[PDB]
Amino acid sequence: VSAYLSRPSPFDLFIRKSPTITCLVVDLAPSKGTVQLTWSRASGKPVQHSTRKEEKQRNGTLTVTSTLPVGTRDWIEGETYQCRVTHPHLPRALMRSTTKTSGPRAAPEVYAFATPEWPGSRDKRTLACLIQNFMPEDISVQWLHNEVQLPDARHSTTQPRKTKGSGFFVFSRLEVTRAEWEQKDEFICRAVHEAASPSQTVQRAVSVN
Amino acid sequence: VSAYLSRPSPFDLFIRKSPTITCLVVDLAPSKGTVQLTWSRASGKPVQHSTRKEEKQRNGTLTVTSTLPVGTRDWIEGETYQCRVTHPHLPRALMRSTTKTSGPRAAPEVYAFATPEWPGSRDKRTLACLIQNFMPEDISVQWLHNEVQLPDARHSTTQPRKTKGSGFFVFSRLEVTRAEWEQKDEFICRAVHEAASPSQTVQRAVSVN
Ligand SMILES: *[C@@H]1O[C@H](CO)[C@@H](O[C@@H]2O[C@H](CO)[C@@H](O[C@@H]3O[C@H](CO[C@H]4O[C@H](CO)[C@@H](O)[C@H](O)[C@@H]4O)[C@@H](O)[C@H](O[C@H]4O[C@H](CO)[C@@H](O)[C@H](O)[C@@H]4O)[C@@H]3O)[C@H](O)[C@H]2NC(C)=O)[C@H](O)[C@H]1NC(C)=O
Ligand SMILES: *[C@@H]1O[C@H](CO)[C@@H](O[C@@H]2O[C@H](CO)[C@@H](O[C@@H]3O[C@H](CO[C@H]4O[C@H](CO)[C@@H](O)[C@H](O)[C@@H]4O)[C@@H](O)[C@H](O[C@H]4O[C@H](CO)[C@@H](O)[C@H](O)[C@@H]4O)[C@@H]3O)[C@H](O)[C@H]2NC(C)=O)[C@H](O)[C@H]1NC(C)=O
């Protein structure tokens, strides 16, 4: 029986200003009892109503995830949120807590690229974004075009991996069509990160030329 | 407990022409008694002598691995190798099999990029490589300078993800130093793939400039 507690996405925190936290509970061998997920703050202030979802998996195990809406100001000013997990036939109560980092920070470096022509695909182009040397690993990536954010499904971002020096890197990939760049030849890759200043974002544009 | 069985890397398979497979056994509860890893083929032909290895991790976990060398021709022609795992404290043994993935083939497209100078850090640059539109997902990636292969610890390659089409993509990152590019400002990103004509390889060169 595992219990994980994740922090809000930077996008939800700093752009949409509606953060949430998710308490994920994985139970290898469940008795199908009533696992209770109670939320609480360190200050004693009340918590908003949380969503809950249970799902049986193919490998014979139940996952319970509860998502708790959190206040923007509250998180940014350093509130500690706790997920208490309880089950009748379980030795003790698992307790996971989360809060905004007070350890080392580093803004990300962003670099945007556009692939050259490849024989037999002159209408297609792949744009790629390197984002590196940032910490913590919490980061959100968006692609913009005509000053407008494209749907998330359009692009693909890799999992945060450690760099050799310090911090993390991720790559983001976005396929684009001739129509797009001929309409306007400028695509922005934007990273959202708490260590970034002054507004928690760092973005870079690239063109197909 | 959980067991994993990998396939041979394209490099070992096609370039060194001495492929091996590994049966990894992760034991979260190190109990007394020797764990058994027995090898076999689907055809029922003799397997070569394998290598057993044991080591305890920092998180109180035991890691036992057995590596079996396999034949080049044998693997390509579609042999299935098999690893039967037997722990002292378990009734039914765990079995894992591996074999050459079979589907349509596609050659990889390689693209290689160099970052511009980031404020402050002038004595180093990051090189990026995008390798996309290939299948199956198996692919080796290596960096070279002066026709000399750099150590694997120097670069970092992401796990193969699905593209919007029908192929897979992978990124690879390598930090270089001022002493290296001033000696010879050219770096090769080389990918080894089954469908990579003409000699199982595709590469592309890049410069810091
Ligand atoms: C039967 O099958 C189910 C799934 O079908 C298995 O359930 C999975 O269990 C694993 C671990 O037991 C879960 O993995 C954990 O995910 C956490 C959340 O992060 C993931 O999800 C977010 C967003 O969804 C992604 O952004 C992120 O990249 C991850 O993919 C991680 O936090 C967990 O730990 C990892 O991160 C921490 C740092 O916080 C590290 O310290 C850890 O080392 C580790 O890297 C972990 O990865 C997984 O989510 C479960 N899947 C589902 C669908 O719920 C059962 O375990 C399996 N049963 C058996 C017996 O095998
Ligand atoms: C205590 O700490 C140890 C490490 O010190 C942890 O051991 C690791 O456990 C995880 C989970 O089993 C292992 O991760 C698995 O890796 C497999 C592939 O191995 C890669 O890395 C090795 C390098 O040793 C390479 O040789 C290999 O080629 C790979 O690059 C994956 O196959 C496993 O599953 C993943 O892939 C499959 C696809 O087939 C997916 O289905 C899965 O979803 C998943 O993505 C898995 O990721 C890891 O290998 C172990 N490390 C070591 C050093 O042995 C213990 O787990 C940890 N204890 C606890 C309780 O967490």
The number of residues making up chain A comes to 209
From the CA atom positions of chain B, what is the Rg in Å?
20
Note whether A167 and A126 are within 8 A (CB): no
Please give the full DSSP string across A111-138, using - where no structure is assigned.
EEEE----TT-TTEEEEEEEEEEEBSS-
- The DSSP bridge pattern shows strands B80-86 and B148-149 to be unpaired
What residue has token string 């595992």?
A2
What residue has token string 């930090």?
B175
Nearest Cα to Cα of residue A195 among A168, A171, A173, A156: A168
Q: Strands across the sheet with B20-27, in order? A: B2-5, B20-27, B62-69, B51-56
Note whether B39 and B66 are within 8 A (CB): yes
Declared resolution, Å: 2.8
What residue has token string 């034991």?
B27
Q: Strands across the sheet with B148-149, in order? A: B148-149, B140-145, B187-192, B201-206
CA of A203 to the centre of ligand 2 (A): 34
Tell me the residue type at A171.
F
A117 touches chain B (CB under 8 A): no
Instruction: Show the domains of chain B with their CATH numbers.
Output: 1-100 (2.60.40.10), 101-208 (2.60.40.10)
Q: The tokens of A51 are what?
A: 């969503």
Distance CA A124, CA A177 (A): 5
Is B158 in Cβ contact with A130 (below 8 Å)? no
Is B158 in Cβ contact with A161 (below 8 Å)? yes
B59 touches chain A (CB under 8 A): no
b/e per residue, A88-126, with b = 16+ CB within 10 A? eeeeeebebebebeeeeebbbbbbbbbbeeeeeeeeebb
Please give the full DSSP string across A28-84, using - where no structure is assigned.
SS------EEEEEESS----PPPEEEEEE-TTS-EEEEEEEE--HHHHHTT--EEEE
Chain B residues with CB-CB distance to A175 below 8 A? 163-164
Distance CA B22, CA B8 (A): 8
Burial class (CB in 10 A: 0-12, 13-18, 19+), A46: exposed
Q: How many C-beta atoms surround the C-beta of residue B202 within 10 A?
A: 21
SS3 A141: strand
Ramachandran area for residue A123 (φ above 0: left; ψ -120 to 50: alpha; else beta): alpha
Distance CA B129, CA B114 (A): 9
Note whether B149 and B156 are within 8 A (CB): no
Q: Does residue A130 line the site of ligand 1, with CB under 6 A?
A: no
Distance CA A89, CA A201 (A): 46
Q: Which of residues 122-161 of A touch B (CB under 8 A)?
A: 126, 128, 130, 132, 156, 158-159, 161
